[PDB]
Design a protein around this ligand. Structure first.
Ligand SMILES: [Zn+2]
Ligand SMILES: [Zn+2]
Lengths: 65, 125, 99, 394, 149, 120, 56, 248, 772
């Protein structure tokens, strides 16, 4: 649904880095170099950012509003 | 006993033997023509609707291939099933309203099958 | 159970999360072991996934290398909270006086 | 593999077209013939063709058990009644063969009297299968049995009794049989030929092989929806619209191969300008074609008019340069990344460290051939550019 | 049947030789080798299947029968009695399987599952009848087994 | 009970059933209609009546039924499915409502418009 | 072997006449005296194989 | 063990043939004490267990052999004077299987439950030639009943126990010495024991009911114990003999 | 010199999924039903006329199904979204309109739009409001764009008609009995009747057994009654091989034992052996002279037609049956029921057609009964059909049949159970897998262990490793990723082309011709078209015509050399799978064609038309040879497999590297994935189901199969990627146990939500009182 705040294994703050991440993918940037720019050395944070699905926007499209 | 092929059949019955023979053949359902002013819709143009005179050409090709050029189209002729029983071709001449001449004409020894070369029609277009 | 597929999936997943790709495990094909091994060695990890690991309890390194990797776990519907059941005296049936 | 031997003339005859029947006995091998058995009677119904033969069977031959013959003749008829006796004598005088009908139609079957190198054909009026009848046994059984002794909607059509009554109405036609030894047989045999010249062009059988295939095999009669075979049946202008809709970026040369070389260049160049707009020497379908006014964005739902402005601005950008920045488009168009991605995917391909590049190479060859069209599109772009500049405030 | 037996023996000895080569080549401290040596889980057969070669996939003690006419699968020719054409798996689990090999292995697995599924109910009925019959027998203090009567 | 249902009462309740069925009404309407019919059939003068009387009684019963649970239905639409004339139907309706005195809500114009406008 | 009557197509049977034994038809007086010997070999398949057992 | 038994196969039991119903169904039979069982196995010992010729001789002695299996050819012969059926025995196959069968033996085998054919009907002209001439029994019997005889004349039994279907030699692969046992898929232990050259003292069976009716209840109990233990071992799982002894 | 490989060959798979695939079977079947079959059924019963008072009639003219609508408004209808029907516990259906004409008072009055019931409307069908809509419209209608659809909604529950797998009708089945005696059976099934007849050899002579007959009759007596009387014809017609006469001799001796030599005698014998199975008469009929003839004409071998009491074709068919029995009695080549060449699939369309036809017949019969009761007696009050068009009949019948899942059609005597199942909404993949489920005809009739096995015939049509573990293991199957199901055909041009191609009419020839080795028979869906020589020429020409489009591509032709027959299968319900054609060791597909497909120049149908890719049936693929890869292609490779990974089903598609795993593990994984915990759809928040499970932080898999991309599984994931360490720890993970990290659980890993509905009803009773 929404990006988790903390990495499951290590626990680094990853919630805030998600939005700018989409900005990086908004430009020409690839996935790996974007993750390097965000500063995700270990692969657990990279996994969490990469594998996430932003279902929250699709659900909000169905919200009452 | 050997099982003959059209090339062998016609070769033996023409070259080795000069005696005329009675054949029976099954044509396709419709012939490559149109009923001449017979009130036709691409309906069944059978042998009956045609007229007298030369109607087709039979070609014995090399390698045993036998074909029947019927104008622009070329049908393929094959052995039918070899019937071993008695098949006699008779004529029923109804000379009078209550009289008829049963006229046996001859035995039927071989049966032929004619079918369109659908492969030729397809690769044609 | 001879589920070598799990080991191959773990290796491929580690390689993918290291290089930011999505390796394919398509039947009768997919990414091969050599490619993920090259991806792992390029990023600075052991080419077979096994890593040098220190025990959390003792603080001493483990004698044998351990096999880390990200794998896809799916939770199941069967949960203990629904399956747990205990029965006291409780009710009985009118015809035969049994639970 | 030429017709190496016996180019054989084939003729058609009609002297006995209505008089020709093919009789076959499934139980009698071709070795034995009925040319030696003197026949007695032949009863036929011309309509509902059902022949019935009766031929004499000899008794003085050693193969007749006259003791059995006397008993069977005694059973079949009365002891001395004889008013309607199947066999005149005290023996079984004759044998009766009944017939069965093979097919309703006999048009496709032909009799071929093959002469010395020439072939003659004749259509068949009918084919009947003859089997020895055993009705005399049933007659004997019947004689023995007689001696011992506004309605609701029905369906008599499917009733065998009414069928028998319908067949019972036809009067029997007695016939004189003539065997193979009869000179009348030979005299009627020669009529199987046809008097005609050796070489005459047939007025009939002129149909083309394609026409023959058609007549023997008669017909029973995404937004892409239609296949190419269905596509080619549509009018040329519609074909251009649908094809260009399918690909949305398509070089002019390929369109000639897609439609076919049989279509004139000007007519193709005439229709394509209605629905396709030129970018860098390549034709791109207009935005309104992909987005009808009643349609909206599948991802955001914005009306097609907004999509028309956004897509054209991206399309207009490719005229200026080969590279388009994805982020700048979203900033100018205020559209979501999903809709922006859809426009670029249709006509651009991602390039690392460069943004998006036009999917097709700059086709100057088409530009050189038709400078008049190239100029025409330029004024159209200026009109389009004027619309966007006042809208997006470039 | 003689040909089938000869082919089965040849393929089995191929698998056994490959497994022996595997075991000889393996180094000590290898996890599957350790787990098979102490007998905790698995055997050398499993190691050979995962490394060297999966053996012939036998259904009811025989090679794969011809589901189609004279052919196990359409991918092989008529009346073909080749090893792969009748069920043998040349590849190992590490190397992965080809579609025919995978199909035959699934054949064997489904055979095993069906056998287990029927055997459970069969043994249940056996047990209940037997316990109904033989429940009342007990050994008395005189060391003689006496019936209820 | 349920056995003292003469041929006439059975025919009447079956008519009520098929009438409320062809109208595509819920089962609650059928239940209420059959209950009202069984209640009206308790009078001696009602049971002893001609076929026209029983038919118009079925019509009035289904009308009252649909009337309570605020379903508008003009008498014309009901008589259109009855093998009788509306002139005797009205008289019998008045006779029975003068004898039974059940609640008869007023036909709502809003729902009548909602029902009738959609028919165009 | 199954002999059928050429006269009417029914199955001929064996019987004994006055001069010799004859094939006869049960429906028509067609008979054929057995003029000389007639044989119908069957050549039934034998028990060829022996199949001792105990091999490897 | 029924849970433990997985219904294994290829357990040819050293003979590469003779499919034997084992596993749970076998137990299902044994406890049921069914008079008729599937695949009844009878084990027989031979006095001269070394001679394969003797083994084949006794096998042919017990194994039921049909007339058709030994007759090289059968022909219906119709002659002007009479009609009959002739059969020529394959003396080659006869001495190949060394069955004590000749023209007189088959003649005596005939006249047994075959439309009560009389001894005068059959005659033995040559050593391998035998002829049979039927008559009109009038019990729905026309002379064309010859065909009927030709239908079942090969189906008469000439040598062997009628209930025995197939017997097989089985070598013993002991390195010290080689012995020949004899397996019989029959239903008559008494007949097998009665036959010459068979160590009837040491012959066993599989049908518990047959053992009971032939040798006594104690032999039946021993056979039950042995059968259960054999089926049990064949599946690798083990039970102490005391349990099965108590059950028996 | 390795063969060049079209690496983008897999691009064919998405394009195929554009036209057909997972759910398109159900949707196409239902649309074909509601657009053709309903009108055909109306045509079947167009006129009803009362026996009493003739000149009165009711004629149906045309029928329509309209749009899905709700009748909550007082005599007013309104469009309703399927989600609304889900919420209010109502059947998402549409009114069924019909136009009629009738004579109330000897005056013709017609109606234009008269309702007769309500037809449930399957989601995403032709009439369903969801079809042809944008995702924004789906959001406005509160529905998931990724919802497969293909299921009915009744009383608020989602029900799916499981695809029924059954034995193909009108085919000769030769098989041994319990006693080991080899016999024959055919289940000649038509709309008029579905009766099976059997052939036994119990005493070395053949008897024919049928339910309608008191005792099995020797077959020669049947032939004698049947039109053929000379024994020579029958013997020639069975077979002329010596062993054939040897086997057939006892039957001839038996028939000669009785004195049957005339068709009359045999008909009398049959009539004596025929029982008075009185249906609804027994007076107007004749006797052992007419009943026997009619029993021969219709009941025995119904599918074999007699034009007018001319049984010659049926004689040929039964002679072929007897020859098959005799030949199979030698080399014990026995048919196996699991070979899908003899299997057929019934979708929602066929079942709903049967149910609707029965309901329509019963409704018309009820209307006739009412008319007959009231028309002749009441008064000059002219009776009219309109006053009694009881609407609830059809609607209630359909609703009950769909909801309860048991189907009783007395007209076909068929009583099925569990036809429909409640769509399990545990996960999106569970919904898809259940959407592509197949049931078996048995429903556990007997634990034979034969059909439960995975026979090779299932290759490429059913997922091999996807079966429900348990009592249904091997009795419930799932369709493969890439497969298609045939629909019923017209059968006319097939006959025309066959006759033109040189097959000789069976009536023309005698039975002896069947014995010749080179002669081949041709069957059209179980009906004999005739005999022909040079079967290879016929097969090649027929296939070439099918490629050119003159013949429907789903019509399949196969050759059985063992029986020397040619089967032309055209009926629907056969399994078909696309394949790439190969001629002269080169595929018809070229990289240029894949480039065109990528550019959109052409679609899958274009490949079908240009003889590049053709469909294949089990029977036809039995003869042709197939290759799996370019390097595997040899000279005798007619076809090339499109993509091997389409062999696995949807559920098995989730398994990464399934070829590296032992198959029972794959089956367990299929069963587990059907029970995964994850999202359901974009409308899951608005949905109110009985039980729902949501994963708090679902993530798309790090390693994904191409099937995942095809079904867009990553759009609705059902798991999490977690860093697992393969080791032993604390000994708390002895048998399949596994430890978790308390910190990870605290940080939301594996967090799950359970949703349960609680619903109550407030009724107003027959008394004017209500629950408050
Ligand atoms: Zn992390
Ligand atoms: Zn005769």
């Amino acid at each position: 649904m929404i990006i988790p705040v903390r990495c499951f294994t290590c626990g680094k703050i990853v919630g805030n880095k998600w939005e700018a991440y989409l900005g990086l993918l908004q430009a020409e940037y690839t996935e790996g170099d974007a993750l390097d720019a965000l500063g995700l050395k270990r692969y657990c944070c990279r996994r969490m950012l990469l594998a996430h699905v932003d279902l929250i926007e699709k659900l909000l499209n169905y919200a009452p509003l | 006993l050997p099982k003959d092929v059209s090339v062998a059949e016609l070769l033996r019955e023409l070259s080795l033997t000069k005696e005329e023979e009675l054949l029976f053949l099954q044509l396709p359902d419709t012939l490559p023509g149109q009923p001449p002013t017979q009130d036709i819709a691409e309906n069944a143009c059978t042998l009956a609707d045609l007229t007298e005179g030369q109607v087709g050409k039979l070609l014995i090709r090399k390698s045993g291939r036998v074909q029947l050029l019927l104008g622009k189209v070329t049908l393929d002729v094959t052995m039918g099933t070899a019937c071993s029983f008695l098949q006699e071709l008779v004529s029923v001449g109804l000379g009078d309203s209550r009289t008829g001449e049963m006229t046996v004409l001859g035995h039927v020894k071989h049966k032929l099958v004619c079918s369109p070369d659908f492969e030729s029609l397809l690769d044609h277009k | 159970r001879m589920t070598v597929g799990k080991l191959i999936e773990l290796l491929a997943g580690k390689a993918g999360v290291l290089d930011g790709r999505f390796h394919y495990g398509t039947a009768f094909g997919g990414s091969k072991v050599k490619d993920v091994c090259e991806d792992l060695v390029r990023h600075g990890y052991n080419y077979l996934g096994k890593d040098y690991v220190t025990s959390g309890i003792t603080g001493e390194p483990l004698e044998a290398y351990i096999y880390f990797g990200p794998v896809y776990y799916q939770k199941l519907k069967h949960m203990v909270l629904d399956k747990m059941h205990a029965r006291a005296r409780g009710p009985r049936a009118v015809l035969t006086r049994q639970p | 593999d030429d017709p190496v031997v016996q180019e054989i003339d084939v003729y058609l005859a009609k002297s006995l077209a209505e008089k020709l029947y093919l009789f076959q006995y499934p139980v009698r091998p071709a070795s034995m013939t009925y040319d030696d058995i003197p026949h007695l009677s032949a009863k036929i119904k011309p309509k509902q063709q059902k022949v019935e033969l009766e031929m004499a069977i000899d008794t003085l031959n050693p193969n007749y058990c006259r003791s059995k013959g006397e008993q069977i003749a005694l059973n079949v008829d009365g002891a001395c009644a004889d008013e309607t006796s199947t066999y005149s004598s005290k023996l079984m005088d004759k044998q009766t063969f009944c017939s069965s009908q093979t097919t309703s139609n006999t048009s496709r079957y032909a009799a071929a009297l093959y002469r010395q190198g020439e072939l003659h054909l004749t259509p068949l009026h009918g084919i009947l299968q003859l089997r020895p009848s055993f009705s005399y046994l049933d007659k004997a059984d019947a004689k023995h049995r007689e001696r011992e002794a506004e309605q609701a909607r029905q369906r008599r059509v499917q009733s065998y009794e009414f069928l028998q009554k319908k067949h019972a109405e036809e009067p029997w036609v007695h016939l004189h049989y003539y065997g193979l030894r009869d000179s009348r047989s030979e005299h009627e045999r020669q009529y199987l030929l046809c008097p005609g010249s050796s070489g005459v062009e047939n007025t009939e059988l002129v149909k083309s092989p394609s026409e023959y295939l058609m007549m023997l095999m008669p017909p029973s009669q995404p937004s892409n929806v239609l296949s190419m075979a269905q596509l080619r049946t549509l009018p040329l202008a519609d074909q251009i619209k649908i094809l260009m809709k399918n690909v949305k970026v398509m070089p002019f040369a390929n369109l000639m191969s897609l439609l076919g070389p049989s279509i004139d260049s000007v007519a193709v160049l005439r229709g394509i300008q209605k629905v396709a707009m030129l970018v860098q020497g390549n034709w791109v379908v207009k935005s309104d074609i992909l987005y009808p006014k009643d349609s909206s964005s599948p991802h955001s739902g914005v009306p097609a008019e907004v999509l028309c402005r956004g897509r054209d601005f991206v399309m207009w950008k490719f005229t200026q340069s080969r590279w388009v920045v994805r982020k700048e488009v979203a900033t100018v168009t205020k559209l979501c990344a999903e809709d922006v991605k859809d426009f670029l995917e249709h006509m651009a391909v991602v390039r690392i460290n460069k943004g998006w590049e036009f999917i097709l190479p700059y086709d100057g060859e088409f530009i050189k051939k038709h400078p008049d069209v190239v100029q025409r599109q330029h004024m159209l772009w200026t009109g389009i550019q004027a619309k966007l500049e006042k809208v997006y405030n470039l | 049947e003689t040909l089938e037996a000869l082919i089965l023996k040849e393929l089995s000895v191929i698998r056994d030789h490959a497994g022996s080569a595997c075991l000889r080549e393996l180094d000590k401290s290898n996890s599957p080798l350790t787990m098979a040596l102490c007998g905790s889980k698995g055997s050398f057969i499993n190691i050979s299947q995962m490394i060297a070669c999966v053996g012939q996939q036998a259904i009811s003690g025989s090679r794969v029968p011809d589901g189609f006419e004279n052919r196990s699968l359409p991918h092989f020719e008529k009346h073909s009695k080749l090893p792969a054409a009748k069920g043998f798996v040349a590849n190992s689990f590490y190397s992965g399987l080809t579609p025919t090999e995978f199909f035959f292995h699934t054949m064997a697995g489904r055979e095993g599952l069906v056998d287990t599924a029927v055997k459970t109910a069969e043994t249940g009925y056996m047990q209940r009848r037997l316990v109904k019959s033989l429940e009342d027998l007990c050994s008395q203090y005189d060391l003689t087994v006496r019936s209820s009567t | 009970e349920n056995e003292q249902v003469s041929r006439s009462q059975q025919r009447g309740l079956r008519r009520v059933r098929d009438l409320c069925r062809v109208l595509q009404l819920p089962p609650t309407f059928e239940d209420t209609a059959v209950a009202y019919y069984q209640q009206a059939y308790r009078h001696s003068g009602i049971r002893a009546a001609r076929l026209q009387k029983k038919e118009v009684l079925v019509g009035c019963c289904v009308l009252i039924t649909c009337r309570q649970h605020n379903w508008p239905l003009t008498m014309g639409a009901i008589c259109t499915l009855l093998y009788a004339d509306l002139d005797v139907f009205s008289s019998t309706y008045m006779q029975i409502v003068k004898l039974l005195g059940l609640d008869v809500p007023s036909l709502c114009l809003a729902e009548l418009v909602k029902t009738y406008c959609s028919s165009f | 072997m199954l002999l059928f009557c050429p006269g009417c197509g029914n199955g001929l049977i064996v019987e004994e006449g006055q001069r010799c034994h004859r094939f006869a038809c049960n429906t028509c007086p067609y008979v054929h005296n057995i003029t000389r010997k007639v044989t119908n070999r069957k050549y039934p398949k034998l028990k060829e194989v022996d199949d001792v057992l105990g091999g490897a | 063990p029924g849970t433990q038994m997985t219904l294994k196969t290829f357990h040819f039991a050293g003979v590469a043939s003779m499919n034997i119903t084992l596993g749970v169904p076998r137990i299902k039979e044994i406890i049921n004490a069914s008079k008729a069982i599937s695949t009844p196995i009878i084990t027989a010992q031979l006095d001269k267990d070394d001679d394969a010729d003797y083994a084949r001789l006794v096998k042919g002695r017990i194994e039921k052999t049909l007339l058709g299996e030994i007759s090289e050819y059968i022909e219906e012969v119709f002659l002007p004077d009479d009609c009959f059926i002739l059969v020529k025995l394959s003396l080659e196959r006869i001495r190949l299987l060394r069955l004590e069968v000749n023209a007189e033996t088959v003649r005596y085998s005939i006249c047994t439950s075959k439309l009560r054919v009389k001894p005068g009907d059959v005659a033995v002209h040559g050593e391998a030639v035998v002829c049979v001439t039927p008559r009109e029994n009038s019990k729905s019997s026309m002379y064309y009943v010859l065909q009927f005889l030709k239908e079942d004349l090969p189906k008469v039994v000439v040598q062997g126990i009628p209930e025995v279907s197939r017997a097989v030699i089985h070598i013993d692969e002991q390195s010290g010495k080689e012995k020949y046992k004899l397996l019989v898929e029959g239903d008559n232990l008494r007949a097998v024991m009665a036959t010459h050259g068979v160590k009837g003292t040491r012959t066993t069976s599989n049908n518990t009911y047959e053992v009971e009716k032939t040798l006594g209840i104690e032999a039946a109990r021993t056979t039950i114990i042995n059968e259960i233990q054999y089926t049990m071992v064949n599946h690798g799982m083990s039970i102490d003999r005391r349990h099965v002894m108590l059950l028996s | 010199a390795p063969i060049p490989t079209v690496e983008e060959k897999w691009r064919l798979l998405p394009a195929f999924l554009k036209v057909k695939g997972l759910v398109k079977q159900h949707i196409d079947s239902f649309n074909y039903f509601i657009n053709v079959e309903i009108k055909k059924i109306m045509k079947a019963n167009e006129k009803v006329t009362s026996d009493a008072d003739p000149m009165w009639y009711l004629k149906y003219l045309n029928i329509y199904v309209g749009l899905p609508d709700v009748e909550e408004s007082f005599n007013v209808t309104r469009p309703v979204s399927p989600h609304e029907c889900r919420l209010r516990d109502m059947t998402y259906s549409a009114p069924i309109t019909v136009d009629i004409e009738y004579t109330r008072g000897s005056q013709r009055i017609i109606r234009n739009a008269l309702p007769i019931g309500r037809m449930p409307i399957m989601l995403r069908s032709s009439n369903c409001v969801l079809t042809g809509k944008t995702p924004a419209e789906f959001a406005k209608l509160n529905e998931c764009p990724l919802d497969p659809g293909g299921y009915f909604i009744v009383k608020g529950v989602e029900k799916v008609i499981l695809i029924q797998e059954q034995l193909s009708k009108n085919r000769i089945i030769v098989e041994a009995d319990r006693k080991g005696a080899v016999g024959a059976s055919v289940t000649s099934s038509t709309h008029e009747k579905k009766s099976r007849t059997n052939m036994a050899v119990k005493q070395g002579r053949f008897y024919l057994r049928h339910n309608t007959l008191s005792e099995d009759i020797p077959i020669v007596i049947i032939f004698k009654a049947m039109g053929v009387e000379s024994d020579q014809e029958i013997v020639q017609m069975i077979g002329t091989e010596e062993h054939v006469m040897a086997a057939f001799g006892p039957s001839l001796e038996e028939c000669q034992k009785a004195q049957i030599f005339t068709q009359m005698q045999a008909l009398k014998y049959i009539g004596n052996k025929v029982r008075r199975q009185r249906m609804w008469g027994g007076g107007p009929k004749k006797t052992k002279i007419e009943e026997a003839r009619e029993l021969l004409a219709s009941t025995i071998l119904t599918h074999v037609p007699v034009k007018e009491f001319n049984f010659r074709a049926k004689c040929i068919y039964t002679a072929v049956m007897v020859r098959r029995v005799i030949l199979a009695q030698g080399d014990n080549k026995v048919d196996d029921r699991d070979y899908y060449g003899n299997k057929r699939l019934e979708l929602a369309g066929q079942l709903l057609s049967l149910l609707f036809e029965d309901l329509f017949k019963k409704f018309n019969s009820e209307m006739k009964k009412i008319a007959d009761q009231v028309i002749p007696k009441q008064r000059a009050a002219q009776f009219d059909v309109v006053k009694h068009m009881r609407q609830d009949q059809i609607t209630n019948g359909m609703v009950n049949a769909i909801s309860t899942g048991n189907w009783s059609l007395k007209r076909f005597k068929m009583d099925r159970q569990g036809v429909t199942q409640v769509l399990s909404r545990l996960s999106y993949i569970s919904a898809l897998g259940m959407m592509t489920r197949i049931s078996s005809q048995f429903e556990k009739t007997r634990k034979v262990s034969g059909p439960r096995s995975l026979q090779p015939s299932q290759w490429g049509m059913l997922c091999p490793s996807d079966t429900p573990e348990g009592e249904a293991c091997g009795l419930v199957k799932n369709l493969a990723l890439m497969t298609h199901i045939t629909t019923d055909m017209e059968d006319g041009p097939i006959v025309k082309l066959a006759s033109n191609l040189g097959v000789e009419d069976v009536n023309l020839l005698c039975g002896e011709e069947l014995s010749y080795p080179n002669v081949f028979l041709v069957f059209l869906n179980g009906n004999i078209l005739g005999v022909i020589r040079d079967h290879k020429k016929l097969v090649n020409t027929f296939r070439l015509m099918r490629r050119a489009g003159y013949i429907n591509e789903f019509v399949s032709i196969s050759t059985n050399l063992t029986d020397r027959c040619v089967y032309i299968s055209s009926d629907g319900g056969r399994l078909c799978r696309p394949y790439i054609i190969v001629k002269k060791q080169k595929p018809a597909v070229t990289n240029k064609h894949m480039e065109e497909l990528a550019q959109g120049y052409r679609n899958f149908e274009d490949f079908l038309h240009e003889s590049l890719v053709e469909y294949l049936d089990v029977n036809e693929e039995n003869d042709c040879n197939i290759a799996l890869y370019e390097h595997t292609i040899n000279k005798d490779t007619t076809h090339l497999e499109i993509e091997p990974f389409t062999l696995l089903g949807v559920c098995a598609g989730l398994i990464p590297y399934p070829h590296h795993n032992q198959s029972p593990r794959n089956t367990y994984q299929c069963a587990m994935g059907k029970q995964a915990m994850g999202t359901i759809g974009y409308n899951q928040r608005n949905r109110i189901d009985t039980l729902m499970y949501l994963l708090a932080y679902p993530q798309k898999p790090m390693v994904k199969t191409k099937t995942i991309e095809l079904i867009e599984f990553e759009k609705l994931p059902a798991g999490q990627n977690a860093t697992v360490a393969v080791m032993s720890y604390s000994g708390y993970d002895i048998e399949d146990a596994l430890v978790l990290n308390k910190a990870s659980l605290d940080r939301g890993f594996g967090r799950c939500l359970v949703y349960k509905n609680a619903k109550c009803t407030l009724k107003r009773y027959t008394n004017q009182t209500f629950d408050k």
